[PDB]
């Protein structure tokens with residue numbers, strides 16, 4: 001769609017603090033597909049309520065481990081490549 005399916009399928013090793021984040025929402029392993037990483041990040045966002053009804057497409061991650069990892073106070077869920085780059089910054 002924005003990201004190829006072959007890139008979404010690929011297995012990755014989170015760096016230790018992304019690994020902590022994913023573990024906080026039930027993630028049981030040391031390696032994941034990008035698609036699974038993004039599932040748990042979706043669960044983490046939705047669990048911590050890092051959203052606002054006024055701006056329904058923006059994650060509000062300031063003052064959170066997520067904002068520390070991603071290096072931003074907020075971001076758009078429409079910008080997939082930018083989201084992939086912020087996750088690549090947190091893989092071995």
Ligand SMILES: CC(C)(O)c1cc(F)c2c(c1)C(=O)N(Cc1ccc(Cl)cn1)[C@@]2(OCC1(O)CC1)c1ccc(Cl)cc1
Nearest residue numbers: 038039041042043045046051056057058059077080083084
């Ligand atoms: C409520 C809010 C802020 O509009 C929101 C919140 C939210 F969590 C998501 C999405 C949207 C969304 O579209 N999603 C899928 C997604 C987007 C971009 C990429 Cl590249 C991949 N996956 C997220 O998950 C959906 C879900 O599985 C929890 C149910 C989602 C996942 C991961 C990330 Cl990093 C950012 C966003």
